[PDB]
């Protein structure tokens, strides 16, 4: 139903090792479709999903030029950050930015985003109204006044309401076979003895898309939030994802425990138990 497009910029200074490096990636939902690396011998925006390849030379040339311009801008932004924080030119620092649009089920703009960070901490963010900014510290307030004076938020709002939604909707249609068809998880429960008196029950969810999923363990219908070990959702490398949840149970109580799986790909939520004689 809902969909999103996000661009992620990373700019990192490397004093004494070369000029600052700029890396950009673009995502539609959980699918990466473009990349740019200033460290490449011939830097260009490159396809990373099959449905983006149909775009013309005008698209790749325009994207590459914009990425080249952005790399130069963030090279200067890194120097500006040194002034605001009174930092030496010998240290390594990172600026990050993520921006994009969220589309509602009706296919229209639901929310726009534009956030920036310095050394992994919030710096400045565009507010939900797409007209004002929130600055994290006094240095970012210097940037906020410059952006207010230069009417940056109106430029962001025009992009987020217009080109961002238009390009995202185009990608969703061109890649509808993969982007708009959810892959349900393949699920099973495994049992691992820890001792003669205790065992781990592990609930698996494999090969699902998109990444959002809910895995919970229940004991006699009661969620075991505190005692559940939950690993981060992880990529399988084929554009689908994996996750598991585990709980340690007394030997002989295993059948009291149920694993519950919620995913967009499933018609109904799943309820699983250890079934050794499957």
């Amino acid at each position: 139903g809902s969909h999103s497009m996000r661009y992620f910029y990373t700019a990192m200074s490397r004093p004494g090792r070369g000029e600052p490096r700029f890396i950009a990636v673009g995502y539609v939902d959980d699918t990466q479709f473009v990349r740019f690396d200033s460290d490449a011998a011939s830097p260009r925006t490159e396809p990373r999903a099959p449905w983006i390849e149909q775009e013309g030379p005008e698209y790749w040339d325009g994207e590459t030029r914009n990425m080249k311009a952005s790399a130069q801008t963030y090279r200067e932004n890194l120097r500006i950050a040194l002034r605001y924080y009174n930092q030496s030119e010998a240290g390594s620092h990172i600026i990050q930015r993520m921006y994009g649009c969220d589309l509602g089920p009706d296919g229209r703009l639901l929310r726009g985003h534009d956030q920036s960070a310095y050394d992994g901490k919030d710096y400045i963010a565009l507010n939900e109204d797409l007209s004002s900014w929130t600055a994290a510290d006094t240095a970012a307030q210097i940037t906020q006044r410059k952006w207010e004076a230069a009417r940056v938020a109106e430029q962001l709002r025009a992009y987020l309401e217009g080109l961002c939604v238009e390009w995202l909707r185009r990608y969703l249609e061109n890649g509808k076979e993969t982007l708009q068809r959810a892959d349900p998880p393949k699920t099973h429960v495994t049992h691992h003895p820890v001792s003669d008196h205790e065992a781990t029950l592990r609930c698996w969810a494999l090969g699902f898309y998109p990444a959002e999923i809910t895995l919970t363990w229940q004991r006699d219908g009661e969620d075991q939030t505190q005692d559940t070990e939950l690993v981060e959702t992880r990529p399988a490398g084929d554009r689908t994802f994996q996750k598991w949840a585990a709980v340690v149970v007394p030997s002989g109580e295993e059948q009291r425990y149920t694993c519950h799986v919620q995913h967009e790909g499933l018609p109904k939520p799943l309820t699983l138990r250890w079934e050794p004689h499957h």
């Binding site: 950009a24 914009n66 990425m67 952005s70 801008t73 200067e76 605001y84 921006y99 430029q155």
Partner: peptide, 10 residues
């Protein structure tokens, strides 16, 4: 462009 064309500094 798909990406944000705009450039203004910090």
């Amino acid at each position: 462009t798909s990406t944000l064309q705009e450039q203004i500094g910090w």
